[PDB]
Amino acid sequence: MLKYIIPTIMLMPLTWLSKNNMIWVNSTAHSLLISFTSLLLMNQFGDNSLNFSLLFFSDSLSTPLLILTMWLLPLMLMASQHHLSKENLTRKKLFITMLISLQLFLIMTFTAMELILFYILFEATLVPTLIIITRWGNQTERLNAGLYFLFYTLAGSLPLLVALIYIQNTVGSLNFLMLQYWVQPVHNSWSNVFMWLACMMAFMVKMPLYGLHLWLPKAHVEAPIAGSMVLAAVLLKLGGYGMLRITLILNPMTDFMAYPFIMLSLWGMIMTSSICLRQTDLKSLIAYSSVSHMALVIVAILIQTPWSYMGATALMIAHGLTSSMLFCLANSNYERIHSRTMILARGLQTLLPLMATWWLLASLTNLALPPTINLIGELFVVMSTFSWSNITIILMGVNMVITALYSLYMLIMTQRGKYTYHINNISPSFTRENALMSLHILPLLLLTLNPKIILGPL
């Protein structure tokens, strides 16, 4: 509620209004504080969900999901600091403003009270993200990532507004989710498929199916300095949750056609992870993880029958961190050596000993050792999706193999002798290198102690 948007918009002139170089520490100081407010009135119910205003129930829903969104902001200025210190302050004042200008809508969205505040705010980004990709790129291939990032996201999300304005005047008012207490079903026709297909395909083009992901590595391979907005674009994607607000209801009873979204993404899950093994560019190698065990949720959501939402929620915020943090490693190791080519960096682990245990705990949580959230987020997937049909144990059982050769080959490539020609790579990871790389593995594993705070209603 205004408890949140108002201070975080109050942030906005906490920055430029300041002096010279004090700016970074000025806003990083406050931006942490809001996290007390983040929890503050939140983590109330529980049962019979919280709605505190007419057009906002901040998050009740058991999709808390908002606490993270308020984390990643003052993880950027620790992240983004590296080469952004080399241009002017009135531009550096900008890049902190639009970056907030993103953070303000992700608080608006995830609440939205309804469908039609979601959408205009579901499309309300792409103004702030697109401007961070095109400027402050690195290569010159960036200019095409500008377009491809649109012309999909916007391409098929217009058929929403044709459909959601079609519901508003058909049955009552969509003004509120919390009233669905009248919903008739959707039986069949050659019209209703389209309705269901229009109310869906806009979401898929964000969390990729194995088709129409053609943009995802185009934008991430070449993308701002620190992953500065690349950490944010790994929040944006998973935020396609809203399919959890719809497909639970609002055409419940068409599962009839589900199968082309099952067998299409269920054989890609065994697939695009395997086209990730021979990659020669590291920020590509991680970008294809992000498809894979993200695209497993799309077979979690379509199937009804909780024990999937038990396991589908834990995943949106499962790689929400692990897949975040890897883009933070591959950034750092790139500061020192200016190729992103994976081969070139070898013979590390002697020269940066403390950063050894940083790779490991990262690459260990794609392996998903049993105790952490990762498996307890996957093993509620397999338990329901097994009951669907027994044969799902094979493919998604293969996923649990190729992903293990997948991860290690990234670490074990950095255990070798190489002294080779590098006179660079002196800096022994000054604190920010290891400070911002923490505040992930500390908060991540921690939740396993009381992991009832990440769960759906079911």
Partner 1 sequence: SWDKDVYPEPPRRTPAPSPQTSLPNPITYLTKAFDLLVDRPVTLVREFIERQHAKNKYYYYHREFRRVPDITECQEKDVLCMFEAEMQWRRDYKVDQEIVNIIQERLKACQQREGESHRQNCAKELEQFTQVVKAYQDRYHDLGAHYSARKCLAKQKQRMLAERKAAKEAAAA
Partner 2 sequence: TTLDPAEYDISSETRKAQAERLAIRSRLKREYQLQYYDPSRRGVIEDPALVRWTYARSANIYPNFRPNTKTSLLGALFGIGPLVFWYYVFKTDRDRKEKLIQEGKLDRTFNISY
Partner 3 sequence: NMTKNLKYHYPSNAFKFSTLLGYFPTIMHRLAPYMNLSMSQKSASSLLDLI
Ligand X SMILES: CCCCCCCCCCCCCCCCCC(=O)OC[C@H](COP(=O)([O-])OCC(O)COP(=O)([O-])OC[C@@H](COC(=O)CCCCCCCCCCCCCCCCC)OC(=O)CCCCCCCCCCCCCCCCC)OC(=O)CCCCCCCCCCCCCCCCC
Ligand Y SMILES: CCCCCCCCCCCCCCCCCC(=O)OC[C@H](COP(=O)(O)OCCN)OC(=O)CCCCCCCCCCCCCCCCC
Q: Which stretch binds partner 3 (CB under 8 A): 39-47, 163-171, 226-234, 269-277?
A: 269-277
Q: How far is the CB of 167 from partner 1 (least distance, A)?
A: 17
Interface with ligand Y, residue 156, by CB under 6 A: yes
Q: Which is nearer to partner 1, 246 or 294 (CB)?
A: 246
Q: Indicate which single residue of 354, 393, 394, 412 sits in contact with ligand X (rule: CB under 6 A).
A: 354
Residue that the structure tokens 């119910």 belong to: 45
For residue 46, say if its preceding peptide bond is cis, omega within 30 degrees of 0.
yes
Q: Indicate which single residue of 20, 48, 90, 420 sits in contact with partner 1 (rule: CB under 8 A).
A: 48
Task: Look at residue 214 and give the partner it binds from partner 3, partner 2, ligand X, none, a contact being a CB closer than 5 to 8 Å depending on partner kind.
Answer: partner 3
Interface with ligand Y, residue 171, by CB under 6 A: no
Q: How far is the CB of 391 from partner 2 (least distance, A)?
A: 7
The tokens for 279 are 């990659």
Q: Which is nearer to ligand X, 184 or 357 (CB)?
A: 357
Interface with partner 2, residue 259, by CB under 8 A: yes
DSSP secondary structure letter of residue 307: S
Interface with partner 2, residue 308, by CB under 8 A: no
CB 273 within 8 A of CB 208: no
In the chain, % helix, strand, coil (3-state, to 5) comes to: 55, 0, 45
- The CA radius of gyration of the chain, in Å to the nearest whole number, is 22
- The distance of Cα 345 from the centroid of its chain, to the nearest Å, equals 28
CB 102 within 8 A of CB 230: no
Rounded Cα gap, residues 58 and 56, in angstroms: 5
CB 96 within 8 A of CB 77: yes
Residue that the structure tokens 């498929």 belong to: 193
Q: Which of 151, 43, 178, 70 is nearest to 443 (CA)?
A: 70
CB 8 within 8 A of CB 54: no
Q: Which is nearer to ligand Y, 198 or 297 (CB)?
A: 198
Per-residue binder mask for partner 3 (CB under 8 A), 210-229, x = binder: ----x---------------
CB 374 within 8 A of CB 368: yes
Q: Which stretch binds ligand Y (CB under 6 A): 65-73, 193-201, 275-283, 403-411?
A: 193-201
Q: Which is nearer to ligand Y, 156 or 240 (CB)?
A: 156
Per-residue binder mask for ligand Y (CB under 6 A), 173-192, x = binder: ------------------x-
Give residues in contact with ligand X (CB under 6 A): 353-354, 356-357, 360, 364, 443, 446-447, 449-450
Give residues in contact with partner 1 (CB under 8 A): 47-48, 179, 181-183, 248-249, 252, 304-306, 308-309, 457-458
